[PDB]
Amino acid sequence: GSSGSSGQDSDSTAAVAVLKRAVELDAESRYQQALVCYQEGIDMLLQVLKGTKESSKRCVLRTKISGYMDRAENIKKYLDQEKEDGKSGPSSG
């Protein structure tokens, strides 16, 4: 190929991007964003893996998905609590 961000497009691709972006957000402390992103990819990968006979790819994939699921969770689990933690509104929330 050639060093240049122009091409590269596919199904799982979107996941690669979404996933990538997620990481960033995660590093930006924007878990609320890195979460969905992470989920957006996982969901995408899931379908990818589902359609992956490769005994290897599956490993990697399954390793990526899950690897992106744990984080997402930890986040969500932290987001759900961070939500109510808000302790700021008209009444409850």
Side-chain angles (χ1 to χ4, degrees):
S2 245
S3 237
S5 180
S6 173
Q8 265 188 83
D9 161 59
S10 231
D11 223 292
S12 339
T13 274
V16 186
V18 95
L19 285 179
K20 260 164 124 271
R21 272 288 168 192
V23 155
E24 298 297 273
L25 289 160
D26 228 51
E28 296 256 71
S29 330
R30 308 180 124 174
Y31 296 131
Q32 237 274 271
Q33 295 214 263
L35 191 275
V36 320
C37 299
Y38 270 139
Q39 309 253 273
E40 306 244 77
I42 287 139
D43 219 325
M44 279 192 263
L45 295 144
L46 262 189
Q47 305 229 5
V48 182
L49 184 263
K50 293 249 193 126
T52 301
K53 257 251 195 125
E54 249 282 35
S55 65
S56 292
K57 302 209 112 112
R58 287 156 119 283
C59 223
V60 176
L61 277 164
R62 282 186 119 181
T63 269
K64 256 187 234 225
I65 281 144
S66 161
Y68 289 131
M69 285 210 84
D70 200 352
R71 193 57 161 162
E73 253 218 327
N74 249 313
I75 284 167
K76 262 237 280 191
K77 272 77 272 264
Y78 144 84
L79 297 176
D80 192 292
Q81 67 181 6
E82 280 253 306
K83 240 220 189 96
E84 59 111 287
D85 275 349
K87 299 182 122 134
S88 216
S91 66
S92 230

